[PDB]
A paper describes a structure:
Human astroviruses (HAstVs) are nonenveloped, positive-sense, single-stranded RNA viruses that are a leading cause of viral gastroenteritis. HAstV particles display T=3 icosahedral symmetry formed by 180 copies of the capsid protein (CP), which undergoes proteolytic maturation to generate infectious HAstV particles. The AstV CP is composed of several domains, including a highly basic N-terminal domain, a core domain, a spike domain, and a C-terminal acidic domain. To further explore the structural features of the AstV CP, we determined the crystal structures of the HAstV-1 CP core and spike domains to 2.60-Å and 0.95-Å resolutions, respectively.
An expression construct composed of HAstV-1 CP residues 80 to 429 produced a soluble protein and remained stable at high concentrations in buffers containing at least 1 M sodium chloride and 5% glycerol. The HAstV-1 CP core exhibited an apparent molecular mass of ∼20 kDa as examined by gel filtration chromatography, consistent with it being a compact monomeric protein in solution. The purified HAstV-1 CP core was crystallized in the space group P212121, and a native diffraction data set was collected to 2.6-Å resolution. Two molecules in the asymmetric unit differ by a root mean square deviation (RMSD) of 1.0 Å, as assessed by the DaliLite server, with notable differences observed in the β4-β5, β10-β11, and α4-β15 loops that we predict are involved in intermolecular contacts in HAstV particle formation (see below). Our final HAstV-1 CP core model contains amino acid residues 80 to 411, with a disordered loop at residues 390 to 396 being the only loop not visualized in at least one of the two molecules in the asymmetric unit. The HAstV-1 CP core structure reveals two linear domains similar to the S and P1 domains of the HEV capsid. Interestingly, another unexpected disulfide bond was observed in the HAstV-1 CP core, linking strands β1 and β12, despite the presence of reducing agents throughout purification, and this disulfide is conserved throughout serotypes HAstV-1 to -8. Notably, the disulfide bond observed in the HAstV-1 CP core lies on the inner surface and may stabilize the nearby basic residues Arg84, Lys136, and Lys138.
Numbering used by the authors: 80 to 311, 314 to 388, 397 to 410
């Protein structure tokens, strides 16, 4: 096998302004999917190798959390970094998070979450598959999620605080083995739209639909980069391109959904495929899938009932058919 080490700062964890459990990060670990901070270059070699080999593994995984504030200056928030073994959305609570492998961190303190291969091993004798075009379950691998609990307060003024709380650093070492010739996957899009208006549609037995304004950076990036939505029975045709969507904003709390998937959006991240034709006017529309495998298998989330928040969306191009 061939190895590749990499250490990078991923971004920052902000203050908790809602007093509820807030999601602040969802870090994909798959080598062709793993994400840099803007103008970061540490993971380029990892993506490159991920496109050249058919199987990958992690030898170790450290997430270092560096406080951006002093512990006596800011109070009332606990940070919880945890391992999502399969990169699968779930309906969890703070307590559920605590049932995962995880580390809690007090505001104003530093800490490092360290994981062993035992914790990170794939189903192929410890290995995972690299090619995100062809499978999810044996391919996607683990994720690091970060949440927070408790309204972040300035201790001097006993007021709401709103700055960054932690620097987030990831250190790992990917190993690769077996061959592939997939330059398809070297250019996957990873981006963010801070100005996206969003809505959800559906009726009993129909797919959950996500509408996004047709002029938005998100929308006009997805159309350009997705293949053409010509794939199929009593459903629309979808693009074969899957996107992971991550909504870290508290404004994601104002998104209503038809039953029974309000939990999935409330959870902050899910998968989508561009669907053909128009659904809401002036919008581009997507089917929503509660797992990556469901997206690849065209098994969309189906509503059971019926019933324009501008939010911010981190999105990741999952594949390149
Ligand atoms: Cl909760
Ligand atoms: Cl809870």
């Amino acid at each position: 096998a061939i190895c590749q080490r990499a250490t990078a700062t991923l971004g920052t964890v902000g203050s908790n302004t809602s007093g509820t459990t807030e999601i602040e990060a969802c870090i994909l670990l798959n080598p062709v999917l793993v994400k840099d901070a803007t103008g970061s270059t540490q993971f380029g070699p990892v993506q490159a190798l991920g496109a050249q080999y058919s199987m990958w593994k992690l030898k170790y995984l450290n997430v270092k959390l560096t406080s951006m504030v002093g512990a006596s200056a800011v109070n009332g928030t606990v940070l919880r970094v945890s391992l999502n073994p399969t990169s699968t959305p779930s309906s969890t609570s703070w307590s559920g998070l605590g049932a995962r492998k995880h580390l809690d961190v007090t505001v104003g303190k530093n800490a490092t979450f360290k994981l062993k291969p035992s914790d990170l091993g794939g189903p192929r004798d410890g290995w995972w598959l690299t090619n995100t075009n062809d499978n999810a379950s044996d391919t996607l691998g683990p994720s690091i999620e970060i949440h927070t609990l408790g309204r972040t307060m300035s201790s001097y003024k006993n007021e709401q605080f709103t700055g960054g709380l932690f620097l987030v650093e990831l250190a790992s070492e990917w190993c690769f083995t077996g061959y592939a010739a997939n330059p398809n996957l070297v250019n996957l899009v990873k981006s963010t739209d801070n100005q996206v208006p969003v809505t959800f549609e559906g009726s009993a037995g129909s797919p959950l639909i996500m509408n996004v304004s047709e002029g938005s950076h998100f929308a006009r990036t997805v159309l350009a980069r997705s293949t053409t939505p010509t794939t199929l029975a009593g459903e629309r045709t979808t693009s074969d391109t899957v996107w992971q969507v991550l909504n870290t904003a508290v404004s994601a709390a104002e998104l209503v959904t038809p039953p029974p998937f309000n939990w999935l959006v409330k959870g902050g991240w899910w998968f989508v495929k561009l669907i053909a034709g128009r659904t809401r006017t002036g919008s581009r529309s997507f089917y929503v899938y509660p797992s990556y495998q469901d997206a690849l298998s065209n098994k969309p989330a189906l509503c059971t009932g019926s019933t324009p928040v501008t939010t911010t969306l981190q999105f990741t191009q999952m594949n390149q058919p």
